[PDB]
């Protein structure tokens, strides 16, 4: 067993839709290619002893233990490998239930698909499954120590790439509301939405939380001063840094009792709660001074009452919880010694950062605190009344929270909302000490102890003594006020031969509307009028750049099949999905070997259309039109033939189609015909000579019309879009220099070759062509290219791309020569006797093509890179 390739998918993909997280591996079965489990000595027993949990796999039998019966009858090792990977990552607490295995075109390689919850964990499980199965086939069993090591590694991977409970809850709420979310790679920030409608959170702070408010909240004395200036009842306190100032400060606060705390503290280090005389105040001051990082200590009046935590989101009180410190009640005539561990044996209590209820830690400090209680370990509580173990009233110690949201006085709600607004925090956690939260803070001597930025609401979503509160819902309401997601219109263009031109035309048409359009094509990624990134940029790695840009209002993404195969789609859904055509030209790449497979792959864009979206399909293409079903949302057809029966039937019942009827680009809205242009005033059609460009214009116009774009905007965009070097790099770029003309193009497959010929054959001058193709294509494609070039052209110069993609140098050139020779031999008389010659250099090929161009001739160039031809024709004027 050798792993040849390991790919991970993060969006809708070839293998499944709504199963975005998948991993696919090319597994080589060098020796066990046709070796069933029933034929392997001791395989079944060793496998079922290593992992007894496989009995829960309801396989194709559909009954408990069906996979075990499948192994009994004899099954290929790829199936058991996928099942053991699923179970291996399932044992680590990660539920996954999708798996597929298919035979590839090559003899010995399988393709195994595993659903994952964590990318690293999924890849690790996929790598470990083959090792486990190889060990089982070699020795009959797998060591238990290696199994435990692998599960511990999987658990570590799951824990490492895990969000915290606050971020997890917020993300779950966003997913429930259908708001897209992605993880930024900088500071554990989560981005909600797309483009100009995006928001960001880290854990609880949003992108709208102010620096000034957070910094003020972090400052205890500044916050107290600000709240006191606003009339908020803060505790009466004073700062002190030297021993001598203590007596004067205690005189100022108003007597006894008092509180001694440090200015800066974490987990309440060195904070005393209640002291009533001199010496204890002295030692508390010493402890706080040695606990503070700046030697300075707060001294304030002590206020009796329970400690409440109030959560304010968007200036509204969302949850109120009373923090009762760790305690035990002897209502069952039992003392502390039994209840300390009786509570610890409750399943609710747990450690870590997931379970709020922590075990009652009987620390030496806790022993001292219960010493100050006035009772002992075996001292039975009187009457069955609460007896406490600590006074910090925190969940980390082992305390409990009581929901008080329904009992807070409205005046208190108003005061706390004012406090949150005064500090300047959209989300704030306010600590209140009061005897009764149901009465105003003025009647009782309630005080505001502190204001917390980025508070943890974990205690409010699981109070354990009241009703849970939907804090994540409140946060999402703040981030997205109405019934609005963060989505921007997404237009995904897929197809075999016209993705780039259609994408650029759509971008231009939408640019006619006053909107910033971010679009990625084969040439590069553009935002507005400026280039944002160079290169290929036809995959999700470039779609993320557009979707995360804060200025993009509409996204038009050219979705090549390569990106879908490699990692799926970069988005969950699209507003418009355009499928132009599916032609079997570059077969054999990946697992795609038949045109049905290619159609299934390209149908991902059509099937990803949201229910309120539109799918623009070519009615003239039978395979594309076959995607009419299994598509959620409306369907729109475009056809170059106005008499298409399917299109007419679709328009009769409904509408939303586009045709080219009598020299017009027209939109059919049912029984109404809306003409856009004469198709001779559209520059890219070149007076209607190029029919494929007319089809691209039809698709683009239909796509923009389905979104409500005005007819005048479509008209202006179609009229002002040019097919020259200023806008189109090499898409039907015609250059005039007087003596002849040069037509540089991007044709590399038989379908685009036929489309190019359908326009070149109309030229009345000499036809010179430099043709070629990528080296990763099949030989039959090269033969077809050669014969088509023989059919359409009069002078042939064959060139092979410098980046040959692993193919031996030259081979494609002589095979295109074989194709042109076959076409030449297929002609009886001198009907078409085009001359042929082959040179393997791009510069030499274009130089020879431009050197021998006669008067009024046409020279067609199909270079590896458009910039080479552009520069070469720019230098020669």
């Amino acid at each position: 067993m050798k792993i040849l390739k390991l790919q991970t998918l993060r969006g809708p993909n070839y293998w499944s839709i709504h199963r975005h997280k998948l991993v696919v591996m090319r597994l080589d079965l060098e020796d066990l290619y046709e070796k069933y489990t029933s034929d392997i000595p001791g395989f079944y027993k060793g496998l079922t002893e290593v992992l007894p949990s496989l009995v829960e796999h309801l396989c194709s039998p559909g009954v408990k233990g069906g996979f075990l019966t499948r192994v009994e009858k004899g099954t290929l090792i790829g199936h058991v490998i996928e099942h053991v990977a699923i179970e291996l990552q399932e044992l680590a607490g990660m539920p996954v239930g999708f798996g597929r295995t298919r035979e590839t075109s090559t003899t010995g390689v399988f393709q195994v698909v595993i659903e994952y919850e964590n990318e690293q964990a999924g890849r690790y499980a996929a790598r470990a499954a083959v090792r486990l199965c190889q060990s089982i086939v070699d020795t009959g069993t797998y060591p238990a120590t290696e199994l435990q090591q692998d599960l511990e590694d999987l658990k570590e991977l799951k824990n490492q790439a895990s969000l915290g409970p606050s971020t997890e809850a917020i993300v779950k709420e966003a997913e429930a509301r259908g708001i897209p979310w992605t993880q930024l790679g900088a500071r554990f920030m989560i981005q909600f939405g797309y483009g100009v409608n995006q928001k960001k959170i880290q854990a609880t702070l949003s992108n709208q939380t102010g620096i000034l408010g957070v910094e003020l909240a972090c400052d205890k004395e500044g916050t107290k001063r600000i709240l006191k200036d606003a009339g908020v009842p803060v505790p009466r306190g004073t700062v002190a840094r030297y021993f001598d100032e203590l007596q004067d400060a205690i005189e100022y606060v108003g007597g006894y009792p008092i509180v001694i705390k440090p200015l800066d503290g974490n987990h309440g280090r060195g904070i005393t709660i209640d002291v009533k005389n001199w010496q204890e105040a002295e030692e508390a001051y010493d402890l706080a001074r040695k606990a503070s990082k700046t030697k300075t200590v707060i001294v304030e009046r002590y206020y009796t009452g329970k400690d409440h935590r109030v959560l304010v989101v968007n200036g509204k009180v969302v949850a109120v919880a009373e923090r009762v410190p760790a305690h035990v009640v002897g209502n069952g005539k039992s003392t502390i010694a039994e209840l300390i561990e009786e509570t610890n044996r409750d399943p609710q209590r747990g450690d870590g950062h997931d379970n709020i209820l922590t075990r009652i830690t009987v620390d030496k400090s806790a022993l001292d605190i219960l010493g100050k209680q006035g009772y002992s370990i075996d001292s039975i509580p009187l009457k069955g009344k609460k007896c406490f173990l600590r006074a910090t009233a925190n969940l980390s110690t082992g305390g409990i929270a009581v929901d008080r949201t329904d009992e807070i006085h409205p005046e208190n709600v108003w005061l706390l909302s004012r406090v949150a607004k005064i500090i300047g925090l959209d989300i704030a956690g306010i600590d209140v000490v009061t005897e009764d939260i149901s009465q105003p803070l003025r009647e009782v001597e309630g005080v505001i102890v502190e204001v917390n930025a980025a508070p943890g609401f974990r205690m409010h979503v699981a109070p354990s003594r009241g009703l849970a509160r939907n804090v994540a819902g409140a946060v999402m309401d703040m981030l997205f006020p109405g019934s609005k997601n963060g989505r921007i219109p997404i237009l995904s263009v897929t197809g075999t031969n016209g993705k780039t031109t259609t994408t650029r035309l759509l971008a231009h048409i939408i640019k006619q509307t006053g909107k910033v359009v971010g679009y990625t094509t084969t040439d590069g990624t553009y935002i507005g009028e400026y280039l944002a990134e160079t290169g290929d940029n036809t995959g999700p790695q470039s779609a993320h750049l557009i979707l995360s840009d804060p200025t993009v209002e509409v996204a038009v993404l050219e979705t090549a099949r390569g990106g879908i195969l490699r990692s799926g789609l970069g988005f969950s859904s699209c507003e418009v999905g355009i499928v132009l055509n599916v032609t079997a030209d570059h077969l054999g790449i990946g697992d795609i070997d038949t045109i049905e497979q290619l159609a299934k792959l390209k149908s991902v864009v059509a099937e990803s259309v949201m229910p309120k979206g539109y799918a623009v399909l070519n009615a003239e293409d039978p395979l594309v039109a076959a995607m009419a079903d299994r598509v959620k949302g409306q369907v729109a057809y475009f056809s170059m033939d106005p008499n298409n029966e399917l299109l007419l039937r679709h328009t009769e019942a409904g509408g939303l189609a586009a045709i080219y009827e009598n020299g017009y680009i027209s939109i059919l809205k049912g029984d109404w015909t809306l003409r856009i242009e004469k198709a001779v005033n559209v520059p890219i059609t070149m007076a209607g000579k190029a029919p494929f460009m007319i089809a691209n214009a039809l698709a683009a116009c239909l796509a923009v019309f389905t979104q409500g774009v005005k007819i005048e905007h479509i008209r202006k965009g179609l009229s002002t879009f040019v097919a020259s070097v200023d806008q189109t790099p090499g898409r039907m770029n015609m250059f005039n220099m007087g003596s002849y003309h040069a037509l540089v193009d991007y044709a590399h497959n038989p379908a685009s070759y036929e489309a190019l010929g359908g326009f070149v054959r109309n030229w009345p001058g000499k036809r010179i062509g430099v043709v070629g193709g990528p080296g990763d294509r099949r030989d039959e494609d090269f033969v077809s290219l050669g014969e088509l070039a023989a059919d359409i052209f009069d002078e042939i110069i064959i060139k092979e791309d410098d980046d040959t993609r692993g193919r031996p140098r030259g081979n494609a050139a002589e095979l295109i020569c074989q194709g042109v020779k076959q076409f030449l031999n297929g002609i009886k008389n001198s009907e078409s006797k085009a001359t042929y010659e082959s040179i393997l250099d791009e510069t030499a090929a274009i130089n020879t093509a431009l050197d021998r161009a006669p008067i009024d001739g046409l020279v067609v160039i199909l270079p590896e890179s458009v910039n080479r031809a552009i520069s070469l024709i720019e230098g020669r004027h």
Partner: peptide
């Protein structure tokens, strides 16, 4: 720190 981190969720105060």
């Amino acid at each position: 720190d981190d969720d105060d």
